[PDB]
Amino acid sequence: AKTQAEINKRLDAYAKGTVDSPYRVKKATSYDPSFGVMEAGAIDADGYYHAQCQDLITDYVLWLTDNKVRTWGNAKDQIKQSYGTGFKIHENKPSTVPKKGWIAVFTSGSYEQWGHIGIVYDGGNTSTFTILEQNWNGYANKKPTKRVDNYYGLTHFIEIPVKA
Ligand code: MMC
Ligand code: MMC
Ligand SMILES: [Ca+2]
Ligand SMILES: [Cl-]
Ligand SMILES: [Hg+2]
Ligand SMILES: [Hg+2]
């Protein structure tokens, strides 16, 4: 498990393009004509579809679990598997405020077909929070980027283990 300080450091490094990850693009990379050239800092964990939302989580979960757990499936499929001990899936109830480093999973509305996923950067309040995510633009080309979300379509949070 990682400490909150380690988690918080890693989130800023994702957003800065400096994260210690072997899946971070070092030089602008392209292989899929349907997507934009991945900029330095984009995370591509599977070698398909350039830098999608789930690529970020694959990397993050690998890091949290010392490379023991590789995610499978699309964003929406993350709530149908377990990343292991100390990971907990919570339904988003309208009371529910997430914590920094938790994983936010969108599975309804326009997000239904593949889902969307990202990391809670600031837990916010009941109205909004700040997410760190890839590919909210659809072009699969940008590094992880922060966005204010209003909980629309957001159905679950994955609580991650945090070391004292
Ligand atoms: C490798 Hg944590
Ligand atoms: C609330 Hg699990
Ligand atoms: Ca990818
Ligand atoms: Cl997405
Ligand atoms: Hg640990
Ligand atoms: Hg939607």
Residue numbers in the entry: 2 to 165
Relevant lines from the article:
LysK, an endolysin from staphylococcal phage K, contains an N-terminal cysteine-histidine dependent amido-hydrolase/peptidase domain (CHAPK), a central amidase domain and a C-terminal SH3b cell wall-binding domain. CHAPK cleaves bacterial peptidoglycan between the tetra-peptide stem and the penta-glycine bridge. The structure has the papain-type fold with a long loop between the two amino-terminal alpha-helices.
For the derivative structure, a calcium ion and a 2-[4-(2-hydroxyethyl)piperazin-1-yl] ethanesulfonic acid (HEPES) molecule have been modelled associated with each of the protein chains, while Cys54 is modelled as methylmercury-cysteine. In this case, ordered solvent molecules modelled in the unit cell include two glycerol molecules, ten additional putative methylmercury ions, two putative chloride ions and 770 waters. In contrast to the tightly bound calcium ion, the zinc ions appear to be bound more loosely and the derivative structure shows they could be replaced by methylmercury ions upon soaking of the crystals with methylmercury chloride. A zinc ion was also found and is likely more loosely bound, as it is less buried, has less protein ligands and could be exchanged for a methylmercury ion upon derivatization.
